[PDB]
Paper text:
CD8 is expressed on the T-cell surface as dimers in two isoforms, the CD8αα homodimer and the CD8αβ heterodimer; both consist of an extracellular immunoglobulin variable (IgV) domain, a stalk region, a transmembrane domain and a cytoplasmic tail. Our results suggest that although CD8α and MHC I sequences change drastically during co-evolution, a few conserved key residues ensure that the CD8α forms dimers and interacts with p/MHC I during at least the co-evolution of endotherm species.
The identities between chicken and mammalian CD8α were low; chicken CD8αα showed a unique helix and a short CDR2 loop as well as minimal inter-chain hydrogen bonding and dimer interface area. Especially for chicken, the four conserved aromatic residues contribute 161 VDW and 262.21 Å2 BSA, which account for 42% and 34% of the total VDW and BSA, respectively. The numbers of residues composing the cCD8αα, sCD8αα and bCD8αα cavities are 7, 7 and 9, and their volumes are 202.0 Å3, 322.9 Å3 and 384.6 Å3, respectively.
Numbering used by the authors:
A (entry chain A), B (entry chain A): 8 to 119
């Protein structure tokens, strides 16, 4: 089943000012996934969609493309937060959209 | 901006055993929306995608199609829970997917 996790499964919380790598492991390859961040608010934010070919699409109002990197690394999807700051905290999820049905990963809490 | 709300804005909580109607008001028409439910868990569930033509697509493992009705009613999207039961409680959101970018509504808490 679908999970979003820290690349470093040993860490419990992200470090302020460090690069943060998350991994999404999708039940299906050759379907892309979207990374999203949920505030403690509950408020939901789209970060990036990664195609099976590692093509990325970011939101239009754009700090995002400069603060996050998306890629597919052999069967799994990756999201990198270049410098993890306070405004990046939240619960991160992977979403796959296959035949107009959505599939959600388990979330990864990322709070100092 | 995008909001999911009770059709009856006067009510604070859904009634056990009553039909529940929610409304999604999308920044864009002639794009469909997906309804999702989030547990208190944080766990996310796809309910249904409604096309701009009121065409519905439900999950494959299917209690869902029999317990929820989706439609577009003049500019807004509607989700009906036929008989609202304990297992239907959660925070409901609308999602639009336009050019591989996702847009999320504010959520509507639905708990007794």
């Amino acid at each position: 089943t679908m999970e979003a996790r820290f690349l470093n499964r040993n860490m419990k919380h992200p470090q302020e000012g460090q690069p943060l790598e998350l991994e999404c492991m999708p039940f299906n390859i050759d379907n892309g996934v979207s990374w999203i961040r949920q505030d403690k608010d509950g408020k939901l934010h789209f970060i990036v969609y990664i195609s099976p070919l590692s093509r990325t699409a970011f939101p239009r109002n754009e700090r995002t493309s400069s603060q996050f990197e998306g890629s597919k690394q052999g069967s799994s999807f990756r999201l990198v937060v270049k410098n993890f700051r306070a405004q990046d905290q939240g619960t991160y999820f992977c979403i796959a959209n296959i035949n107009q049905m959505l599939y959600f990963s388990s979330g990864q809490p990322a709070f100092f």
